[PDB]
Structures are given as structure tokens and as C-alpha cells.
């Protein structure tokens, strides 16, 4: 119910993977809760994962135009220290809810009967799902869901997505312009995730955290034949394009060091 709010010691660490265009902005709040049994730490995970959305000509078949785009963003925190527990994390999965309106009616002028039903719900471009978690870590996947277009909403799992009648000879000309692409595709993703962790006292001072950011890219292919447009879709074209960073934490000295990063 009440746990846990008192004196804090904050530390920050920031780092970028040039190779992958991914930036981790990590904040470490050491929690000295005088009502609590153990050591506590709040890890706030922010940063930027570029969309790395690209448009190109196939090397073997330059007449075919390819758009590569992030279908999923990957976020995870793990540890190996047996003295460390994951005791809280946000976001969590929740049960979807919806509004329903249902109507029956009759007319007599003659006899007539009518029925209608309306479901009302809220939509996100990208849905954040907890894909796994246990006392030693948690992994989220932020998945493309539904997108707004003229003539209605469209599913991220529709294959003709983003394809268009070419407005030119270039690859980009084969796909919808930026003003029809959402921020997480046109630009990238700004992660905000939190984890609260405990540490057993008198059994060691240091622990190591593996924080991972990344993308799963889908690929949409388009080319012209017979005055009809050919569009095809390869899902999970490039999975787990991720960067992993190892942070070392000293629960006694309140010290945080970046131990490693792959890839650079």
C-alpha cells in the first residue's frame, strides 16, 4: 500500500551506440527508506531509439523498391545478482476496457423492428506489452498496432501498408510521405520505463545490470508490373537489432559505472 518514499541519492549515465543510433539515458535513484528492510534502487530508463526507417533499391533487383521500418521497439532490464530482486516495474499489462451502447426499437404506422450496437474504445499507434518478467528482470516490447489514414484506421499487420502509387522514380516515391507516417516511424521512439529493485544486505556490495534497447524492423516491398502495383511484406525482416549496456552498481558507495556496451 504505502511503500516506498524517503531520502534519495541520484546518479546519471548516458550513452550512444553510433552503429545502431540508440541512446540510453539512465537515471539511478538510490533509495534510503528508513522503514524498509533492504537496500532499494529505482532505475528510470529513458532515451532515444531512432526509427532507422530507410528506403532503397534491391541490389539484385533495382526495379524493386524497399521500405524498412521499425515494427517493434525492445526494452529490457536484467540482472544476475542473486541478492537483487525486481519488486516493482512500470508499465504493466492491463485488461482492455470498452464502452457498449445497445439499442432496440419498433415502429407502427405497418410493423417494423430495428437493432443497433456500438462499441467504443481507445487506440494507440504502438502498444506496450510486458513480454516477460521475473525477480531478476523484465522485458517489454512496444509493437506497431494501428494507424490513421484517409478512409479509416489500418492495421500494422496489413501488408499494403505505407505502399502508394509511385509519385516518381525514386524508392521513396513508392511510399507514403512523412506526413502520413507516425512519429515512431518517421522519427523514432522515446522510451519511458521504470523498475524498482531491492538488494540484500551483508551479502555483497556490487551488482551488474544489463539494459537493452533496440528494434525489430519489418520490410515492405513495392514494384510496378502490368500497370498494376505489386506490394509484398516481410515481417521480422531484421529482428533484435539491439544494443546492450552493462552497468555496475555499488550499493554501499552509491557509485555507478558503465562497464560495457555492444555494439559501440
Amino acid at each position: 500500500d504505502i511503500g516506498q518514499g524517503a531520502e534519495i541519492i541520484k546518479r546519471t549515465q548516458d550513452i550512444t551506440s553510433k552503429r545502431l543510433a540508440i541512446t540510453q539515458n539512465i537515471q539511478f535513484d538510490f533509495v534510503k527508506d528508513k522503514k524498509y528492510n533492504k537496500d532499494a534502487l529505482v532505475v528510470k530508463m529513458q532515451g532515444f531509439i531512432s526509427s532507422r526507417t530507410t528506403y532503397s533499391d534491391l541490389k539484385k533487383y533495382p526495379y524493386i523498391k524497399r521500405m524498412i521500418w521499425p515494427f517493434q521497439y525492445n526494452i529490457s532490464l536484467k540482472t544476475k545478482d542473486s541478492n537483487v530482486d525486481l519488486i516493482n516495474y512500470l508499465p504493466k499489462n492491463k485488461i482492455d476496457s470498452a464502452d457498449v451502447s445497445q439499442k432496440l426499437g419498433y415502429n407502427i404506422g405497418s410493423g417494423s423492428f430495428n437493432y443497433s450496437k456500438t462499441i467504443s474504445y481507445n487506440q494507440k499507434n504502438y502498444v506496450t506489452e510486458v513480454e516477460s518478467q521475473n525477480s531478476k528482470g523484465v522485458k517489454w516490447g512496444v509493437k506497431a498496432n494501428s494507424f490513421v489514414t484517409p478512409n479509416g484506421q489500418v492495421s500494422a499487420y496489413d501488408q499494403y501498408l505505407f505502399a502508394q502509387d509511385p509519385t516518381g522514380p525514386a524508392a521513396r516515391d513508392y511510399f507514403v510521405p512523412d506526413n502520413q507516417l507516425p512519429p515512431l516511424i518517421q522519427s523514432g521512439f522515446n522510451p519511458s520505463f521504470i523498475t524498482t529493485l531491492s538488494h540484500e544486505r551483508g551479502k555483497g556490495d556490487k551488482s551488474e545490470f544489463e539494459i537493452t534497447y533496440g528494434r525489430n524492423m519489418d520490410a515492405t516491398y513495392a514494384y510496378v508490373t502490368r500497370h498494376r502495383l505489386a506490394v509484398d511484406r516481410k515481417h521480422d525482416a531484421f529482428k533484435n537489432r539491439n544494443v546492450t549496456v552493462k552497468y555496475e552498481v555499488n550499493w554501499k558507495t552509491h557509485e555507478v559505472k558503465i562497464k560495457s556496451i555492444t555494439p559501440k
Binding site: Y36, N37, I87, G105, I108, V130, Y157
Partner: protein, 266 residues
């Protein structure tokens, strides 16, 4: 009033089930008993099993159709479960009756407005003064515009249309995985609260039993030559993770003592 906090965790990596237990020990001078507020969170995988796309005449999948949590004290201890959340809701809905006349015609209608959730949380009947338990059960599940459906939907010809999509392979005639309810295919993240009272002349230490469980249903479809039909079999598989924690009411500590991973399969 004085407050003491602590935590305890228990994992079943095999079943992909995790218990996060958050504890507030309360000492209230205006109270003759010790109070313990216990929040039970963590993870319970659905255990969802992708269907084989190669299956031709008949195909099947497993999905998480119910989640069960319980918190208990032992008959021989002085610890009673006095309060908890959530409690059962006496559901409310809104009505609009309309009557209309024109001059000749005579219309009337009634409209009802209510909430619809894919999974519903209700109390366990075995709840008593030393045990509280909840069941999160698949409730109102929509295919596309079709539905809502549940574990026991039955169309006289097409059977249970719960996850039936539509001339293809059987294992390819299920709806897309993403079209399924999150709790049917992903992870349940419980968030349950309970308040327990302890007699001060009781034992310095007590034992609490926390149980997370999943009921997996078998959904299958088959081709009779004319249509595709489906059927749902409840609790065809059951995975249960039982933990026993030792509570030190004197020093406000908690320690995991027992673990039991149990697999039932029909």
C-alpha cells in the same frame, strides 16, 4: 501508528510465473492486534501455444483462459484475513427509454449503456476468514466485429467461433495472434491486495501460502467438408505455483520457505 516495510519474491522459471510480495507491517496503539498489508503482484504467463500452420484437417492451440490467485493463513495460527481488494462489483448500467408519436406512426426504443472487458475479476468461493482468492476469467472476447464470445460460446453449426477466422490449411484458419486478447496470449500482471490481523499473544512467526495458477484452454477447429467448426475445452492444462512464506511478526521480516510447481494435464 508505526509502519515497517519489506518484500519477498518467488519464481517458477519453468512455468514462467513470478511472485512479488510487498509488505506493510502496522503497529497501531488504538488496535489490540498486529496488522499486515500484503500486496501481491508479479507475473503469470498465459502459456499460449502457437498453432502449427501445417495442420490440415484439424488443428489446436492453447490459451490462458483463467488466472487464479489465493492468499491463505493456517488453521492453527491466530492470523485472519480481515480485508482485501478488489471486492465483487455490483455492476451498474445506464438506461434510456424513448417513446415517439407522429401524426400516423408510433415508435418506441430502449438503449442500454455499459462497460465491456475481455477478462473479468471475481472472488473465489473458497474465500473465508483465513483465505481470500481471486479468479480472472476470460469474459467478453471479440473476433472482429463478431462477438462477444467466451469459453462456452456455441453456435449450432459453427460451434465456438472464439478464435475461428473463416479455404486454407486448418492451422492457418485461426485469427491472427495479435487479434487475440492480451491476457489470452501474453502475460497476466496481477495486482491484488489483502489485509491480515495477528493476535499479539500469538506465535512470533506465522506461515502464509500464496498460490498463482493458470488454466489453459484447448481451442481446436476442424473441417467437416462443408464448414470450419470450433470447440473450446476448459482447463485442459493447469500450471500451479505454490509458495509458503514465513512471517516474523516480531522483527517484521519475511522469508520464503516452500515452493511447489505442479503440472496437471488432461
Amino acid at each position: 501508528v508505526t509502519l515497517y516495510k519489506t518484500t519477498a519474491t518467488a519464481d517458477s522459471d519453468k512455468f514462467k510465473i513470478s511472485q512479488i510480495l510487498t509488505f506493510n507491517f502496522i503497529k497501531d496503539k488504538s488496535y489490540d492486534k498486529d496488522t499486515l498489508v500484503l500486496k501481491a503482484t508479479g507475473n503469470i504467463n498465459s502459456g499460449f501455444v502457437k498453432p502449427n500452420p501445417n495442420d490440415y484437417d484439424f488443428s489446436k492451440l492453447y490459451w490462458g483462459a483463467k488466472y487464479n490467485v489465493s492468499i491463505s493463513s493456517q488453521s492453527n495460527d491466530s492470523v485472519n484475513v480481515v480485508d482485501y481488494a478488489p471486492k465483487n462489483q455490483n455492476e451498474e448500467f445506464q438506461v434510456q427509454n424513448t417513446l415517439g408519436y407522429t401524426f400516423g406512426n408510433t415508435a418506441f426504443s430502449e438503449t442500454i449503456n455499459y462497460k465491456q472487458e475481455s477478462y473479468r475479476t471475481t472472488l473465489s468461493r473458497n474465500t473465508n476468514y483465513k483465505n481470500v482468492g481471486w479468479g480472472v476469467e476470460a469474459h467478453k472476447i471479440m473476433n472482429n466485429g463478431a462477438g462477444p464470445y467466451g469459453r462456452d460460446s456455441f453456435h449450432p453449426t459453427y460451434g465456438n467461433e472464439l478464435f475461428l477466422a473463416g479455404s486454407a490449411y486448418a492451422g492457418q484458419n485461426f485469427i491472427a495472434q495479435h487479434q487475440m486478447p492480451l491476457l489470452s496470449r501474453s502475460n497476466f500482471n496481477p495486482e491484488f491486495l489483502s489485509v491480515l490481523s495477528h493476535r499479539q499473544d500469538g506465535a512470533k512467526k506465522s506461515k502464509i501460502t500464496v498460490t498463482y495458477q493458470r488454466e489453459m484452454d484447448l481451442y481446436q477447429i476442424c473441417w467437416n467438408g462443408f464448414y470450419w467448426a470450433g470447440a473450446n475445452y476448459k482447463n485442459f492444462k493447469t500450471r500451479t505455483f505454490k509458495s509458503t512464506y514465513e512471517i516474523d511478526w516480531e522483527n517484521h521480516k519475511v522469508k520464503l520457505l516452500d515452493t511447489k510447481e505442479t503440472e496437471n494435464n488432461k
